[PDB]
Amino acid sequence: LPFQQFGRDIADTTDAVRDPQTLEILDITPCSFGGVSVITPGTNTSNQV
Amino acid sequence: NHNAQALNTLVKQLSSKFGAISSVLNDILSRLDPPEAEVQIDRLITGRL
């Protein structure tokens, strides 16, 4: 809507925003992240991971 | 439903001031000076913990 500037998710976090220079709507998407896990056998057996 | 609501409540807890002036870490960092900013982040981190 013309008055509305920011959009928010169900859990009260921003998911959309409106550019002030140009009246368009943009979907804000977080940069990718995740947990790094290392798979290895016993160090006595080998060192490959 | 229990699991979904628990996650929702955990995410929702970020938006509360928890005794500090603002619930936004960037706002408190930008507006205020390292000592009292440290006080505010202390409040935020202890509450979120």
Binding site: D9, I10 | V11
Partner: peptide
Amino acid sequence: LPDPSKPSKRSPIEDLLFNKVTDLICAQK
């Protein structure tokens, strides 16, 4: 018994149980 026609290879009772049980996920992520 399993139903060959269904791609999931599930019995009709299993199919009914699966169907009857169901941006929040993105926000939690």
